Amino acid sequence: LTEEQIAEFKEAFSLFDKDGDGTITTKELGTVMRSLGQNPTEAELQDMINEVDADGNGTIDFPEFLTMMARKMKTDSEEEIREAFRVFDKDGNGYISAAELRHVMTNLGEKLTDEEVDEMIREADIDGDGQVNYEEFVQMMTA
């Protein structure tokens, strides 16, 4: 395990843990879902948590969240990734730009930095054209 992954696990938790008390409630889950365009019922939020709430205390802590992140995509991800490509590629020209990546991050809550947006583009960019095409994206998401 890299310090890099730890980094990523912290970001991922902090998408849900909006108050940063260190636990994910149904309310925080529901909030994240709604921003993703879904409207889960209260029962559904309970169910999502209770699949992974090892101590049965009705919330999710860091290691229980790690379990969430560790369960595979693993047979229906191709379509989920095709869909994801569409949301990222707003003008649909088949290439994700820095500016389109920035919007996604924002919509996910991040509002810094530009260099880091470029960095993200740079790392996903196999052919060197400065943007992310569908295949480059596929690999950025299966990394």
């Binding site: 912290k10 970001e11 991922a12 559904e44 999502m48 969430m68 989920e80 991050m105 998401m141």
Partner: peptide
């Protein structure tokens, strides 16, 4: 890097979807 929230939104979406299937 900075892929965490992206990974999480992908993860949770499939979770919610896999929730509904499971009951």
């Amino acid at each position: 890097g900075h892929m965490g929230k992206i990974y999480a939104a992908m993860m949770i979406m499939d979770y919610y979807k896999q929730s509904k299937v499971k009951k």
